[PDB]
Design a protein around this nucleic acid. Sequence first.
RNA 1: GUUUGACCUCAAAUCAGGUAGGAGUACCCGCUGAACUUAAGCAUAUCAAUAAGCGGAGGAAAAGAAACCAACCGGGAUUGCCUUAGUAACGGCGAGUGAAGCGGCAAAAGCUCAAAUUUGAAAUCUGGUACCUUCGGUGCCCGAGUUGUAAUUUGGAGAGGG
Lengths: 184, 69, 198, 79, 130, 186, 74, 52, 117, 83
Amino acid sequence: VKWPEYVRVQRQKKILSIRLKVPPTIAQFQYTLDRNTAAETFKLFNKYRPETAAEKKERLTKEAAAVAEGASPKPYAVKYGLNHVVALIENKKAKLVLIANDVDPIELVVFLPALCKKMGVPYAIVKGKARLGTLVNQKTSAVAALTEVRAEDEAALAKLVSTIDANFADKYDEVKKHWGGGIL
Amino acid sequence: VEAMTLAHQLALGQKNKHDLVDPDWFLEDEKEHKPITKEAAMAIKEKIKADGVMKNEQRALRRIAKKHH
Amino acid sequence: MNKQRTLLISSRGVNYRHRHLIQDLSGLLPHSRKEPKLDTLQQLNEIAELYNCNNVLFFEARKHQDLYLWLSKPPNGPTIKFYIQNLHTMDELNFTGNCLKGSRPVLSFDQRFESSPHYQLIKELLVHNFGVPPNARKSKPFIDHVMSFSIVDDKIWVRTYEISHSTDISLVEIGPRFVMTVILILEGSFGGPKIYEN
Amino acid sequence: NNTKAMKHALERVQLPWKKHSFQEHQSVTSETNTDIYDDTERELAFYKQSLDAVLVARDELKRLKVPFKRPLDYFAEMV
Amino acid sequence: SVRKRKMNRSSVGKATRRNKDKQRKINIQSNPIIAANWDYSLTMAQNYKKLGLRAKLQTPAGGKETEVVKKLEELASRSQSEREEEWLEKLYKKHGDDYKKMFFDKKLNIYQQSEGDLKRRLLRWKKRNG
Amino acid sequence: GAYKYLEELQRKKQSDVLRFLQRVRVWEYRQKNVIHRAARPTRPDKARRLGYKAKQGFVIYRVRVRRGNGVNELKYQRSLRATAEERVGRRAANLRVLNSYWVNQDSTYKYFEVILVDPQHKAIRRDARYNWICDPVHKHREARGLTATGKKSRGINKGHKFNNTKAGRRKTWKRQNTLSLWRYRK
Amino acid sequence: DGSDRIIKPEINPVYDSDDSDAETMPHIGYDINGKRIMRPLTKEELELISKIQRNEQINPYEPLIDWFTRHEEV
Amino acid sequence: SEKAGHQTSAESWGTGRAVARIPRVGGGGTGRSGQGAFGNMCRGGRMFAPTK
Amino acid sequence: HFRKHWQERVKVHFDQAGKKVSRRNARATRAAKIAPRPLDLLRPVVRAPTVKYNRKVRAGRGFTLAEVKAAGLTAAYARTIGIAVDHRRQNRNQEIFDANVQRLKEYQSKIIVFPRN
Amino acid sequence: TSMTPAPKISYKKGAASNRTKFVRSLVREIAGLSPYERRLIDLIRNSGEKRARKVAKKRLGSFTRAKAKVEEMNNIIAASRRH
RNA sequence: GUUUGACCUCAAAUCAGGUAGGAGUACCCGCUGAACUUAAGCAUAUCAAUAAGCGGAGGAAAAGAAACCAACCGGGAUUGCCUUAGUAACGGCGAGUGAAGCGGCAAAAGCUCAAAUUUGAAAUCUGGUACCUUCGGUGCCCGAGUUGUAAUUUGGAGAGGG
């Protein structure tokens, strides 16, 4: 029998990753947040999805029409740009940081969890960059964070951060232990 | 082959011990994927053992030879 | 008692003529340590500790033709800034003699070296710097070469002679020959106040 | 520039060479051999100065039982 | 040549062009005043000297003002939008000369403009309006 | 900006994490063909500082080249990077080669990532900062050693150290080895 | 006369265990002091060579150390 | 012309052939074959001391 | 020095006259297209290095930023008026700096600028 | 006479730009040590700077970089052994 | 959920449109590349970093705005001509090879990105469609892009405000 070359290559890649020993900096992912807390975090984030192209165009057209005939508060939305997120982090401006575990360039995000830990900003790792992208109207984002949550959800965000602390930062505080991937 | 070269280099005082330390389808690639000395290569190889104008020109050349010889 | 090691390094701009002297000095100084080209100087203190070199012979070169040899001890030894003009080395064919590599030398010093404090000070360094420990790792038993030093016209002349025994004995000039002059002397190893100026 | 610094340096650098055998010194001062443009008499003067110390060292080694001449069975490297 | 020999022998003719004469007599085309006074008979340097304009600033290699009055004569020969004007009208009729109060007016002063900018705009509005 | 962190990390190539990354990537590329396209660059910072833009028209390619050179002692100074650039240009003659950067190497083969720009795409043609590459004079830059690696190989640099080839060795040789005669002989 | 300085201890020119150099017909030459040398690799070296030939090698699998990231930035 | 006379191929017929040693055009069956070339004495050949 | 094929490359400057005529025609064309302005930019007065020639005073590329600032204008605006500006030349002589400032001041007075429109 | 006209690029050698220093420290912590830095620290643990400096000089092209590398290794060890 | 969908990778279309081969080749840009000949017979050397061969461009091409040249009361993109000069330097100082700063002149144009958050609004762009005042412009729509498209900026600084 025979199989597609790309299929064989990708299948062998999984075996190589499983069997190969990885340094402590790698494998920090896949020790992801539990299903329940991740689901709650996604539910909270869904309330702050940034305005999409269609909605923004509709709002601008409505404003133009109103002006043609003759003071809203600051917009609130999740910040997801990797460069923008990294610029917000290290400035003590971000409250919650989400990191994807399936970034194609691993080195692109190895430092982000450690940088967040050094800065003390709460952070969590969730499975799948596609899930992060879906909630921000983009294919993938690899990261997601909140900066200005509404007062109505301030308590919810604080409780979520407190829960995530124990769920991820305390359970996986030993992620630096013996190199992972040691599977027969 | 390089093992013999390293052993030969270690035989003389050029370097010593201190200087030395100063899936199947994947292991196959790993196995298949430094300077060498001619003396070591030779040692390992040995160890592996179990007309008108023409006549005028000729006359002129003969005259020249007779004058100079 | 005589335990010493000499450190040799090349300064920026060292040319072929100076390289010949640096190379032929090693052939007669088995205890010497050779290191690659170095430049700005103070690192010599650390380099000496790296190889336990009790003496340093730094060949300063203000230009690509002039040569300036520095002789001192790493920890607290005085330094003399020599200047060499007649750069003759073993590359010249006039030195037809040959000497055993690593053989113990015989040192001869002119009596004029005792006539001034500066000459006496430099003589103390020269006596052991050009010598060789008898029972060192790379030392050799037999004596087969002689080093000669002389001073005239306020400049020291460096000369060496092979010793040949005939079937009583005769000596033949060998090795590099050059003249040196003392430019500056400092109280410390590449530092401290000036001691004497020529 | 003064002799005080020279004395201070000599007192700390000078070693007791005179208290050990000649083998540990290997240095001979050519007495009365106080050494130009001729290029011929200078060479002979240097030759004699070196020969005096050569003879002194030869006598010093003769005082010891170690052989002086090369055995002729020695074939080490030569510069 | 190969192609040239065939082209001459061929009946296609040649793309005859004659512009050598036009390569020298080049009409000035960067000024009407100079053109009306420029003389093609004289050289560029001679024309500049006659007109008075300096042809070269650096010292030329080798040995060598009515028009200027015309050049000098050439020296002698934007209102706020409707929304901005209305906004300035509201600012003036609600605060007046109280620039400090207007600066802290969160409602009208959505854009936190400085007192200097506000007074500068108000002065222009007063100049253009009542 | 996270690009500084990526640049700093890429400098510690000998690090264990980067060693493992190279070990995985060399095998991944060794399973693929000698020349194969890359969906996205593996070193975003290096490409970005080399003129890369995340817009339609830019293409990233990966090519494998054998290492090594007294029959085999002939130097054939043709550089591996220049050969890789020429090969990718020939395979992508419709594209234009801007530059390339080291991404990985193996004991037997080397790996380089090359950035290409399509001059036919209207995005590049309508971009003032990149429309220059569409000039015909820029055709096959790698083939004439106009790239960074090509220029470095030619030794075109300011200073006395490059006098022999400050403006091309052949041009200098032709200019110097020419008899100059004027109407009025000097 | 004189200047500020520290009198560092003298340097012993002893030869360490490793100095990039070794230590010293009817004979194999003459040794030190001039006497005739009358005529009459370790397994560790071979093992090291074999291991190097296959890149075999202490433990690299120690846990990471958060010496810097431990101190929260203020 | 710098190429005058040089646009020809010829080779000397050795020696002792009852013929001048001037190089002669090769080929055959054309008339020009066997005629002298490259010499100032040859018809249509390179002129002596070309006016550079 | 005739060990090479120099005869293949013997450059004889028969063109001197035609080249001079072409240069003059190019200058005339530039004047026609640059009639109001001078053909060459105002270059500064500078002193030469290589002490063998330091006694000589010669022109330079362009005035330094400090000279332009002291002249009462700006480097960006100076370029549009034809004043050469050098961003790498440092001033190291007060006498030369004063002469350059005076030259710039005189140039500013001699120039007449037409309306931008 | 001297004029001190204005500064240049060479005058931009100021402080370490503490943000860059933080980035470098984070990279060093996360990146780890190279195979030769591992040997350097292993010898420092028992042999000290003696062997580490020689190893750095052998690996590097000059002793000026070797001393800087030894100092960096010592600084890393000091924080790691206590913090 | 014994399910459905997100992605990432890889496929095929006679899918819609573009791009490449090749020719010419005096000059240009790279690779490759000898001999005859010249020397003290000759390996260094000279012929030669040439002849021929291969690849890639246009009316010119390359290079071009110093990690330069210099040691001065310092010059300030590259390129071209006289001179520097048959000097320095190289070469069994053997035949011979052999430069460059400066000086005089032609021309003189500077610049664009990476790396600090648009974050109070991916504001960027290809493509398809309906029109028009069709070298292109507008509305609509799918898409490229957040693993970074818009604005500003390169130490000559530069950025947030009055």
